[PDB]
Design a binder for this molecule. Structure first.
Ligand code: FAD
Ligand code: NAP
Length: 295
């Protein structure tokens, strides 16, 4: 049922870029682009939470062809236009200062993508992944913890759940549970899809909660910059109480250094009721209700 590897690296699907739009507003840090590709002419199908690979042109320092890089799909299975004809990505241009050099280094595939022009042909593979799938149960509770581009799979869940056109297209999935997104980014201008996320909260106040952790505009109780683990700590009991429901699913996507703080917070909450979080968590993973995707 779940589509996987309809296209592989040795024979990728060649899709055409339809649009490449900026997501970081003025005054924000870095570049993050929402890129939409045309899937017509191929049979690439996918579902929420999956990823696709992108093979950039060129060779590496050793003269070897560039390998694919994975990107979390940012659109629902129907595409942003709900026409089953496209797929979108949320790509940050990777750039860092070279060790003891000061010179900025630019990621190969992400620079290629963020600067790509509409009409360009791109090699796509996939889809891949069965670790971040959304429950078919419309009554489920969905906790979403994300940082930066980790918002990608969350957008696919939230759009399917709350977009008017999606609800009209998915008679089998009329969401009426509770979803809570805790999103961490450095600045307000960096809140990806801010306008749309807030529109959902306004229209579905009883079904969607939105919490931000803005590091350059907020500080935690300790005086440090506000990060996602700080928000989880702040609402640890509320989160634990929700997680206890057998119908609750939790999704974590973003940097590889966020789970540690998250676990510390939930561990203290569960310990109050004589529960060892590490063990409970293991059981949640085994049951397919604790979804993590970081790097
Ligand atoms: C399952 C999955 C989903 C992903 N989803 C997304 C997504 O939705 N959006 C997105 O933008 N990215 C996503 N990524 C990351 C993506 O796959 C690429 O790794 C990213 O875009 C960088 O690739 P690049 O080709 O631009 O950089 P490359 O040319 O491949 O350079 C990367 C290399 O630079 C070095 N490096 C990286 N960071 C630093 C640093 N901070 N300091 C010093 N050295 C460093 C490392 O040696 C690294 O191997 C995802 C990754 C995976 C595994
Ligand atoms: N499938 C996957 O494995 C998957 C999928 C999608 C994304 N990703 C990963 O997620 C990352 C997205 O990064 P981005 O560039 O989009 O992020 P970003 O916009 O630069 O920032 C995200 C926020 O996280 C903060 N942060 C730093 N260390 C943290 C920690 N240990 N715990 C929690 N927050 C921390 C940052 O701090 P400051 O404000 O102080 O800078 C910032 O506010 C990528 O590196 C990508 O590899 C992985």
């Amino acid at each position: 049922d779940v589509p996987v590897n309809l296209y592989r690296p040795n024979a990728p699907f060649i899709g055409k870029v339809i649009s490449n739009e900026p997501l970081v507003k003025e005054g924000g840090i870095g570049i993050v682009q929402h890129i939409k590709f045309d899937l017509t002419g191929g049979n690439l199908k996918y579902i929420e939470g999956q990823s696709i690979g992108i093979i950039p042109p060129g060779v590496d320092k050793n003269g070897k062809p560039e390998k694919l890089r994975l990107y979390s799909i940012a659109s629902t299975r129907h595409g942003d236009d709900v026409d089953d004809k496209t797929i979108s990505l949320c790509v940050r241009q990777l750039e860092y200062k070279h060790p003891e050099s000061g010179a900025t280094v630019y990621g190969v595939c992400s620079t290629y993508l963020t600067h790509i022009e509409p009409g360009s042909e791109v090699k796509i593979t996939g889809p891949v992944g069965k670790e971040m799938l959304l429950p078919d149960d419309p009554e489920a509770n969905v906790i979403m913890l994300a940082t930066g581009t980790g918002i990608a799979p969350m957008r696919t869940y939230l759009w399917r759940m709350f977009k008017d056109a999606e609800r009209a297209a998915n008679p089998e999935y009329q969401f009426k549970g509770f979803s809570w997104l805790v999103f961490g980014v450095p600045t307000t201008p960096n809140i990806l899809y801010k306008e749309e996320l807030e529109e959902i909260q306004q229209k579905y106040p009883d079904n969607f909660r939105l919490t931000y952790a803005i590091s350059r505009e907020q500080k935690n109780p300790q005086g440090g910059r506000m990060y996602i683990q700080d928000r989880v700590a702040e609402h640890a009991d509320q989160l634990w109480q929700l997680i206890k429901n057998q119908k609750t699913h939790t999704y974590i996507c973003g940097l590889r250094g966020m789970e540690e703080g998250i676990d510390a917070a939930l561990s203290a909450a569960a310990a109050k009721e004589g529960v060892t979080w590490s063990d409970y968590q293991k059981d949640l993973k085994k049951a397919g209700r604790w979804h993590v995707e970081t790097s």
